[PDB]
Amino acid sequence: AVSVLTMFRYAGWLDRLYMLVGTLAAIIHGVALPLMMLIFGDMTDSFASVGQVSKQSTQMSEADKRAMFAKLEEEMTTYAYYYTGIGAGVLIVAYIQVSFWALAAGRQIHKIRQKFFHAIMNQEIGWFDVHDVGELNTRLTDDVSKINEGIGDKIGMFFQAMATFFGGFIIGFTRGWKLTLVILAISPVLGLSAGIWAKILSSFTDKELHAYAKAGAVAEEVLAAIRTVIAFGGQKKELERYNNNLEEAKRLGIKKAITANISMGAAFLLIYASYALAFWYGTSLVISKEYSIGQVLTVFFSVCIGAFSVGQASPNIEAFANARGAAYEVFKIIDNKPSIDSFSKSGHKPDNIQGNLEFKNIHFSYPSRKEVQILKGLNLKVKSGQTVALVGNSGGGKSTTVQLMQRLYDPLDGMVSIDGQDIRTINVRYLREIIGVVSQEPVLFATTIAENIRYGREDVTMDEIEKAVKEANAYDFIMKLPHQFDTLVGERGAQLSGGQKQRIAIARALVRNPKILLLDEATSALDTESEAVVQAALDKAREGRTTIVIAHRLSTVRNADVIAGFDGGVIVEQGNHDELMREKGPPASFWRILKLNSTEWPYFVVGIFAAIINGGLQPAFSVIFSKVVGVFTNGGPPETQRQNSNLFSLLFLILGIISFITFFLQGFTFGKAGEILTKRLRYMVFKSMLRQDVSWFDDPKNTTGALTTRLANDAAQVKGATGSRLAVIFQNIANLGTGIIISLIYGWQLTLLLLAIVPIIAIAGVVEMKMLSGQALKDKKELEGSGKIATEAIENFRTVVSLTREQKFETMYAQSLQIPYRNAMKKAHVFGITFSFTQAMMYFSYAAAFRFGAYLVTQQLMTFENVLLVFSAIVFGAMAVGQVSSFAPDYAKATVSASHIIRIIEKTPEIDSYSTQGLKPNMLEGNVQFSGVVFNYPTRPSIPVLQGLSLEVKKGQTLALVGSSGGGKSTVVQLLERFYDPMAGSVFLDGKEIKQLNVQWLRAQLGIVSQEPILFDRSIAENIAYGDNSRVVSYEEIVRAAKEANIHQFIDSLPDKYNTRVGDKGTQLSGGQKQRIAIARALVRQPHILLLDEATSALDTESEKVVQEALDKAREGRTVIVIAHRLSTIQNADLIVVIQNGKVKEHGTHQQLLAQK
Ligand SMILES: C[C@@H]1NC(=O)c2csc(n2)[C@H](CSSc2ccc([N+](=O)[O-])cc2[N+](=O)[O-])NC(=O)c2csc(n2)[C@H](C)NC(=O)c2csc1n2
Ligand SMILES: CC(C)CCC[C@@H](C)[C@H]1CC[C@H]2[C@@H]3CC=C4C[C@@H](OC(=O)CCC(=O)O)CC[C@]4(C)[C@H]3CC[C@]12C
Ligand SMILES: CC(C)CCC[C@@H](C)[C@H]1CC[C@H]2[C@@H]3CC=C4C[C@@H](OC(=O)CCC(=O)O)CC[C@]4(C)[C@H]3CC[C@]12C
Ligand SMILES: CC(C)CCC[C@@H](C)[C@H]1CC[C@H]2[C@@H]3CC=C4C[C@@H](OC(=O)CCC(=O)O)CC[C@]4(C)[C@H]3CC[C@]12C
Ligand SMILES: CC(C)CCC[C@@H](C)[C@H]1CC[C@H]2[C@@H]3CC=C4C[C@@H](OC(=O)CCC(=O)O)CC[C@]4(C)[C@H]3CC[C@]12C
Ligand SMILES: CC(C)CCC[C@@H](C)[C@H]1CC[C@H]2[C@@H]3CC=C4C[C@@H](OC(=O)CCC(=O)O)CC[C@]4(C)[C@H]3CC[C@]12C
Ligand SMILES: *SC[C@@H]1NC(=O)c2csc(n2)[C@H](C)NC(=O)c2csc(n2)[C@H](C)NC(=O)c2csc1n2
């Protein structure tokens, strides 16, 4: 499924030179940094040699030194020259690498995309029938971008990474071969620890995801069943179920958070212990007078940077692997030789042809469905100038003879010859342009009528092509509205009708001046008004050349003189009609609202204290590191070096263990707070949504899938704005402020210099990221601009290949892609320049910092201990701040947008939902006066409905209404339980307005039955118990409801009824019994008034009688309102009054029998 080192197969000599120079620059830039460490080591050795000042006899003599301080000055001047030279070299080389690699990638991608479109627009139609279209286009858009990203940036930087790895290891083995081995021994431990912690975290995350998805099942269930849940008024039970299920997800997320934070703690402890071991074993050697402090530093740093690089070049291999995976398919689409080329110039040129088509034993079956044999041989011959008509159900599926005419497929064992010569030898393009074909649905292109006609053949003299357009149905529909020119017809803009689309397609076909014409479904589902003109145009085109017509309409059949119509694959004679039946027939959150939401003010003091401690440790690390270097640079008594070294190594170890315990505690408290916040947010969001109203649920913006994703994968992001985003800011301040205060105390000069320089590189990186993101957005904009013509061409491939215009779309694609070709190159150059400037600023800042430090030391202001402390507390503090900011769950987004969205959902208005504001009368007469009411759906108010209704209900009534279930035109049943709020018409129940009535009381008296009885995973007995939600639930009434609904005989099988859950579609229930238990659940509440509807029950044809008897018993027991399209049920209905828009108030028989069929 991959292909290695064939990608560059499309690379020219210039591209190969670009790649070679880029690789050389990557090698040089990778080797640069170990040389930086070597020069730093020599610098430290020189300072240690000069600043020893251990001789008290010469401490004052000769004005102290003032002679070899000049040597130090000269050595530091030449080292500053080394630093600035390597900086300039990197400044050139980084650009030479990135710009050249990205230019080569851009050229390769442009060639790949252009020739890939050329190849895909070359394959035969059968390939398109076998494969898909949407996935194919998304492949065109996505795989090319994957290849670009990979074989540009990532292969550009992988060579840098390996060059740094080799350079660092050569430096180490060259200078400190004793220390390098022990550093090599301790290095894999960090990687192994990281890997094992990552594996544990991944396992915990997967377990938590499954445990929560167990709850997500019921989350999705009672939101897809939201209508039934609201109607039955039992949201409390689902709230309880969701809380119980989330009780486990919270507990597993606790372990996940603990694992992640203790993983980071171990990652810090191992690093600190590595520093401890390295400097312990280096100090021992230095005291043994083997290695100098410079030789320890330049070897340790070189080895660690080498290991870091070889570990950091994982993504540049992952991206290359992904690019290879995409490139395999992209390349297999190319190089695929088609049976029909339509591009090769091979083929004889017959001129002055007649067109005596013929067919002899044409066997063909669609490769999409090879098992089904459509065509089983035909024998037929025609003469030029004689039209042939085919009549039947379809032309072999759908105009199979038409499809095979233009080489769109390949016949099996069949032979066809236009003039005695097989169509295999003739040129494909020549055959295509001598055959005219009109589609049943004439697709056009989002372009003017001028070019739409131009795509007929060669756009020639515009006056000549207009004269070609001068056929019938012109001069009226082409000038009045179309402004005589530049119509720009398309789905979007200047949209026309099929009556004119067919005519313009016919005009386009006549422009080509075909020799043989094919007609297929000229007026397939077209309006009869547009008829009798398109037929006239077709006839006047027919009088010229031979044509074959297949159409359902009999008018063209009559018009045609010769008719060989048949069906079933068996040929029938031409000319006569014998034995041919002819029946006529969102704003950003303020971030204090989130903290107020996280009301647990405990669990945060401990976290803040731990974060402050951990942030303050890194400056203490810099202090101890500076002291370690100072022990040898500004050395004193040789016998105290051992004690100082042991103390400082023990200090590293103590710092490591205290940092590890700091993350243990901080992670415990912050993860606990985050998980409890997530559980609270999920519970409250579910409560708010179940309180929410039917109108809000019906809003198509709140699609159930997106809503469930918001409940699941968005309510857990807020963990990243009150948690990590509170810990990281305090850690960063306790790091940087503590570093800068110590720097100000000791080396305020160098402190100000470095604190003025560091913001420059910081803002340079920030602006680099901004401009890169902006350029990527713009490039995606033009890429989608090209993708519109790409998809417009690919979607209508059948038509564009039926027409001979094939290279036109390739040329248009090239023209559309030309601009992104230059945009990519300009973006590549900009990225190269900014990368080179950021690296050059880093190295030049390093050089200037040590040059100023050397000046100050020569001036005898601060020692090298202080210089190194200030430097390593200002720069390495900022780098650690950047790393800690990077290691955060993204406060910018994923957290900021999700948090505000769910805050809006939580603070949503309550639209006539459950509340204490309600009247609950103790009597219920069961009378509703549904008259003088008008209502429109809030989701689609543009279509006014439900106008002029007068209804009256009494006790024992069996009111039967007729309303369209399509679009829910009969929404009276919906309005009864206040699914929607009436705007003008008032409804009075028992002489009381429902507005003052309690919503729960109203919904506790309405036995509604839906069309499709959606079912939960709950057992059958408790499903029946669902009727009496928020009421007394017990047993031996479910049995009574079952007896009433006549389900006892069916539930005799597995009579337990308690474990018979319909889970996994287990214990399956068919439609009839599911409806029967739906009415059972309606009845178990024992409501005074019932609503019913039966739509698909009539499909059962067996349970109809049982469900009708159950409904009969229910309605004789109590008043029932029925609305259904089934006239059979109402025929049965007895005490009824048909009403339609208030027009009828009695039996259909009583007035005109409009009600009866
Ligand atoms: C988890 C993650 N780590 C890194 O992103 C990272 C990459 S590099 C590195 N750290 C070097 C060692 S390099 S690890 C190592 C250590 C030893 C050896 N070896 O050859 O023995 C090799 C390697 N190696 O694989 O490169 N770190 C230092 O110099 C150093 C001194 S204080 C300090 N870090 C503080 C405690 N950490 C942070 O502020 C911080 C924030 S986020 C984070 N760390
Ligand atoms: C060692 C340092 C100090 C001197 C660096 C010299 C470079 C400026 C040279 C080295 C190899 C050269 C290149 C070698 C080959 C070409 C191919 C050539 O590609 C084209 O044909 C595009 C022409 C166009 O602009 O239309 C453009 C210049 C380039 C990259 C050369 C430009 C300049 C390069 C990078
Ligand atoms: C000033 C020189 C001696 C030292 C520094 C070298 C690089 C910083 C510059 C100088 C000349 C530049 C080249 C001059 C001209 C071109 C052609 C131009 O590309 C094109 O117009 C077409 C390239 C293609 O698509 O093949 C941009 C890249 C390139 C190679 C440039 C790449 C970057 C180069 C090598
Ligand atoms: C990261 C994993 C894979 C290995 C980490 C090893 C470190 C945790 C060990 C290795 C050597 C140890 C050091 C070896 C010797 C000493 C001296 C000793 O300290 C003293 O004060 C004793 C002085 C003396 O009696 O000589 C004990 C602690 C210390 C710093 C040890 C601290 C812990 C170190 C750095
Ligand atoms: C006399 C001494 C004590 C003066 C101390 C100066 C402090 C009051 C200033 C100097 C630099 C500031 C820091 C510069 C950088 C940042 C930005 C920010 O760090 C981030 O990475 C934020 C990331 C994000 O939330 O997007 C948090 C505050 C912090 C640490 C600042 C906290 C306040 C600091 C330490
Ligand atoms: C546009 C971006 C990449 C910033 C570019 C900055 C560099 C051009 C500057 C910043 C700091 C400068 C350095 C700061 C201090 C010194 C010491 C200074 O003194 C000498 O070396 C003495 C020279 C003499 O008199 O012979 C001049 C060179 C050097 C390395 C400077 C070289 C030029 C550097 C690298
Ligand atoms: S060790 C690999 C490489 N390290 C250096 O380049 C380097 C030279 S000096 C030095 N690090 C001092 C000892 N480092 C710090 O003070 C320090 C504090 S925080 C920090 N470094 C962050 C964690 N470092 C990195 O992310 C990092 C990437 S490569 C690298 N260090």
Supply the CATH number for residue 412's domain: 3.40.50.300
The tokens describing 993, both together, are 């307005």
Give the nearest ligand 7 atom to 622 CA. Answer: 16
* Together in a domain, 10 and 155: yes
Q: Which residues pair with 988 in a beta bridge?
A: 929, 993
Of residues 804, 787, 805, the one with CA closest to residue 795: 787
Residue 618: CB within 6 Å of ligand 1?
A: yes
**How far away, in angstroms, is 87 Cα from ligand 2 center?**
22
For atom 2 of ligand 6, the residue with the nearest CA is 841
Structure tokens at 37: 């460490």
Distance 736 CA to ligand 5 centre (A): 6
Do 339 and 411 fall into the same domain?
no
**806 in a structural domain:** no
Closest by CA to 1110, choosing from 1137, 1084, 1146, is 1084
User: What secondary structure letter does DSSP report for 509?
Assistant: H
Distance 741 CA to ligand 5 centre (A): 12
Q: Which two tokens stand for residue 85?
A: 């030279």
Residue nearest atom 9 of ligand 7, based on CA coordinates: 301
SS (H, E, C) 211-247: HHHHHHHHHHHHHHCHHHHHHHCCHHHHHHHHHHHHH
- Look at residues 1093, 1135, 1098 and name the one whose alpha carbon lies nearest to residue 1115: 1135
Resolution as reported, in Å: 3.8
Q: Are residues 59 and 113 in the same domain?
A: yes
Is 143 inside a domain boundary? yes
Q: What angle do CA 656, 166, 268 make, to 5 degrees?
A: 10
Distances (CA, A) of 290 to 294, 300, 812: 12, 15, 73
Residue 1075 C-alpha from the chain's centroid: 39
Phi and psi torsions of 288, nearest 5°: -70, 10
Q: Which of residues 563, 583, 616 is at a domain's end?
A: 563
Query: Closest Cα to residue 359, out of 426, 418, 424?
Result: 418
| Contact partners, residue 526, CB within 8 Å, separation at least 6 | 498, 499, 502, 534
| 306, 450: one domain | no
Q: Identify the residue whose C-alpha is closest to ligand 7 atom 22.
A: 880
Give backbone dihedrals phi and psi of 380, rounded to 5 degrees, phi first: -170, 145
Whether residue 1111 is contained in a domain is answered as yes
Q: How far is the CA of 96 from the centre of ligand 1 (A)?
A: 30
**Boundary-marking domain end, from 563, 597, 620:** 563
Integer Cα distance of 252 and 624 in angstroms: 40
Ligand 5, from 612, 614, 724, 729: best to mutate by most atoms within 8 Å of Cβ? 729
855 CA to centre of ligand 6 in angstroms: 13
**Mapping DSSP to helix (H, G, I), strand (E, B) and coil, where does residue 1029 land?**
coil
CB-defined site of ligand 7, < 6 Å: 301, 304-305, 308, 618, 622, 625, 872, 876, 879-880, 883
Q: Which helix (H) or strand (E) holds 556?
A: helix 554-559
3-state secondary structure of 1011: coil
Question: Is residue 956 within 8 Å of 1010, Cβ to Cβ?
Answer: no
Q: Which tokens sit at 181? A: 């081995």
**Which ligand lies nearest the alpha carbon of 892?**
5
- In terms of domains, do 337 and 479 share one? no
Place of tokens 């007649």: 354
671 alpha carbon – ligand 1 mean position (Å) = 24
Lookup: tokens for 265: 């703690």
CB 732 less than 6 A from any atom of ligand 5: yes
Q: In what order do the strands lie in the sheet with 1089-1092?
A: 960-961, 1120-1123, 1089-1092, 1006-1008
- What is residue 7's DSSP assignment? G
Rg (CA), the chain: 41
- Cα-to-centroid distance, 162 and ligand 2 (Å): 25
Top mutation candidate among 99, 114, 835 for ligand 3, by most atoms within 8 Å of CB: 99
437 & 328 share domain: no
Do 950 and 1068 have their domain in common?
yes
Q: Is 729 in the pocket of ligand 5 (CB under 6 A)?
A: yes
Could you give the CA distance from residue 378 to residue 568 in angstroms, rounded to a whole number? 12
Q: Taking CB atoms and a 6 Å cutoff, what residues make up the pocket around ligand 3?
A: 14, 95, 99, 107
Indicate which atom in ligand 5 lies nearest the CA of residue 725. 25
Alpha helices (H) in 288-342, listed in sequence order: 293-312, 315-333
- C-alpha–C-alpha distance, residues 218 and 238, integer Å: 8
Instruction: Give me the torsion for CA of 387, 388, 394, 398, rounded to 10°.
Output: -60
Supply the residue whose CA is at minimum distance from atom 23 of ligand 6.
Answer: 77
Starting at the edge strand that comes first in sequence, how are the strands of the sheet with 992-993 ordered? 928-929, 988-989, 992-993
Residue 972: strand, helix, or coil: helix
CATH number at residue 38: 1.20.1560.10
What are the angstrom distances between the C-alpha of 238 and each of 235, 686, 691, 1016, 1064? 5, 9, 12, 11, 19
Residue 1138: strand pairing partners: 1146
Exposed e or buried b per residue across 463-476, where buried means at least 16 C-beta atoms within 10 angstroms of its C-beta: eebeebbebbbeee
Rounded Cα gap, residues 323 and 703, in angstroms: 35
Q: Is the dihedral of CA 838, 844, 847, 848 positive or negative?
A: negative
88 Cβ below 6 A of ligand 2: no
Looking from the CA of 799 toward its CB, the CA atoms found within 13 Å total 19
Helix, strand, or coil (residue 1069):
coil
With residue 953 as reference, give the H or E element that holds it.
Answer: none
Q: Which residue has tokens 């708010």?
A: 688
Same domain, 375 and 341: no
Q: Residues 457, 463, 468, 472: is their CA dihedral positive or negative?
A: positive
Which residues touch 223 (CB under 8 Å, ≥6 apart)?
689, 704, 707, 708
Measured from the Cα of 269, ligand 4's closest atom is 1
Phi-psi region of 1054 (alpha: psi -120 to 50; beta: other; left: phi over 0): left
Using DSSP's 3-state secondary structure scheme, residue 36 falls into: helix
- Tell me which long-range contacts 532-541 makes (C-beta under 8 A, separation of at least 24): 533/472, 533/473, 533/503, 534/473, 534/499, 534/502, 534/503, 534/506, 535/559, 536/472, 537/471, 537/472, 537/473, 537/503, 537/506, 538/506, 540/471, 540/472, 541/471, 541/506, 541/509, 541/510, 541/517
Give the list of residues 6+ apart from residue 1055 with CB closer than 8 angstroms, or none: none
Asked if the structure places residue 946 within a domain, the reply is yes
Backbone dihedral angles phi then psi of residue 444, each to the nearest 5 degrees: -115, 180
Indicate which atom in ligand 1 lies nearest the CA of residue 271.
16
The secondary structure element, H or E, covering residue 843 is helix 807-858
Q: Whole-angstrom Cα distance, residue 1066 to residue 1070?
A: 12
Interatomic CA distance for residues 1083 and 1028, integer angstroms? 10
What contacts 24+ positions apart, CB below 8 Å, involve 224-229? 224/704, 224/1014, 225/1014, 225/1016, 226/694, 226/697, 227/694, 227/697, 227/979, 227/1010, 228/1010, 228/1013, 228/1014, 229/690
- Of the CA atoms within 13 Å of residue 47, those in its CB half-sphere come to 33
Based on the number of CB atoms within 10 Å of its own CB, is 675 exposed (0-12), middle (13-18) or buried (19 or more)? buried
Distance CA 79, CA 199 (A): 46
Residue with tokens 């920030």: 766
Q: Are residues 335 and 375 in the same domain?
A: no
Residue of 268, 299, 879, 883 best suited for mutating to test ligand 7, as the one with most atoms within 8 Å of CB: 879
Q: What angle do CA 678, 681, 686 make, to 5 degrees?
A: 125
Residue for token pair 């948690």: 723
DSSP secondary structure letter of residue 384: T
Would you give the DSSP letter of residue 1098?
G
Together in a domain, 960 and 1106: yes
Give the C-alpha separation, 634 to 863, whole Å.
8
C-alpha closest to that of 715 among 761, 678, 664, 673: 678
Beta partners for residue 992, in sequence order: 989
Residue 171 within any structural domain of the chain:
yes
Instruction: Give the list of residues 6+ apart from residue 1082 with CB closer than 8 angstroms, or none.
Output: 1007, 1008, 1009, 1027, 1090, 1114
| CA distances to 375, 391, 398, 553 from 395, in Å | 10, 8, 5, 14
Burial of 298 (0-12, 13-18, 19+ CB in 10 A): buried
User: How far is C-alpha 911 from the geometric centre of its chain's CA atoms?
Assistant: 33
Cβ–ligand 2 distance for 20 under 6 Å, the answer no
* Domain termination residue (choose one: 509, 536, 563): 563
Residue 966: helix, strand or coil by DSSP? Answer: helix
Residue 737, CB half-sphere, CA atoms under 13 Å: how many? 10
Same domain, 13 and 59: yes
Asked, for residue 341, whether it belongs to a domain, the answer is yes
Query: Atom 11, ligand 4: which residue's CA is nearest?
Result: 277
Instruction: Indicate the pairing of strand 945-950 with strand 931-935.
Output: antiparallel
Q: Which residues does a gap of C–N over 2.5 Å follow in the chain? A: 585
- Both tokens of 1137, joined, read 């009054």
- d(CA 672, ligand 5 centre) in Å: 27
Distance from the alpha carbon of residue 486 to the mean position of ligand 5, in angstroms: 61
Neighbours of 1125 (CB within 10 A): 17
181 CB within 6 A, ligand 2: no
Question: Does residue 643 have its Cβ closer than 6 Å to ligand 4?
Answer: no
Ligand nearest to the CA of 80: 6
| CA 205 – CA 18 distance, rounded (Å) | 44
What burial class does residue 234 get, using C-beta atoms within 10 Å of its C-beta: 0-12 exposed, 13-18 middle, 19+ buried? buried
Ligand 4 near 267 CB (within 6 A): no
Q: What's the domain range around 988?
A: 928-1132
Location of structure tokens 């090599």: 184
Cβ contacts of 757 within 8 Å, gap of 6 or more: 845, 848, 849
Question: Is the separation of the CB atoms in 994 and 1003 below 8 Å?
Answer: no
Question: Which residue has a Cα nearest atom 8 of ligand 4?
Answer: 273
Tell me the C-alpha distance between 552 and 571, whole Å.
18
CA pair distance 377, 390, nearest whole angstrom: 16
Ligand 4: centre distance to CA 649 (Å): 6
Give yes or no: residues 997 and 1097 share one domain. Answer: yes
Q: Give the distance (Å) from ligand 1 centre to CA of residue 85.
A: 28
H or E, element range at 619: helix 605-633
Cβ neighbours of residue 584 closer than 8 Å, sequence gap 6 or more: none
Q: How far apart are CA 595 and CA 542, in angstroms?
A: 79
Q: Is the CB of 186 under 6 A from ligand 4?
A: yes
Residue nearest ligand 5's atom 7 by CA: 737
Residue 881: closest CA among 614, 653, 1059: 614
Residue 605, Cβ density class (10 Å: 0-12 exposed, 13-18 middle, ≥19 buried): exposed
Give me the half-sphere count of Cα atoms (radius 13 Å) on the Cβ side of residue 451. 14
Nearest to 755 by CA among 852, 834, 621: 852
Give the ligand at the shortest distance from the Cα of 646.
4
CB half-sphere exposure, 995, CA atoms < 13 A: 8
**Do 139 and 273 touch, CB atoms closer than 8 A?**
no
The total of structural domains in the chain comes to: 3
Cβ–ligand 5 distance for 733 under 6 Å, the answer yes
For residues 845 and 825, give the distance between their C-alpha atoms in angstroms, rounded to a whole number.
30
**Residues, the chain:** 1157
Cα–Cα distance for residue pair 358/426, rounded to 1 Å: 15
Amino acid at 464: E
Give domain status of residue 655, yes or no. no
- Distance (Å, whole) CA 628 – CA 620: 12
Amino acid occupying residue 867: V
Q: Is 998 exposed, middle or buried (0-12, 13-18, 19+ CB in 10 A)?
A: middle
Nearest CA to ligand 1 atom 32: 618
Three-state DSSP at 1051 gives: helix
CA-CA distance, 167 to 302, in Å (whole number)?
A: 8
**81 within domain boundaries:** yes
For the chain, how are helix, strand and coil distributed in percent, rounded to 5?
60, 5, 35
What was the experiment behind these coordinates? cryo-EM
Residue of 304, 666, 876 with the most ligand 1 atoms within 8 Å of its CB, for mutation: 304
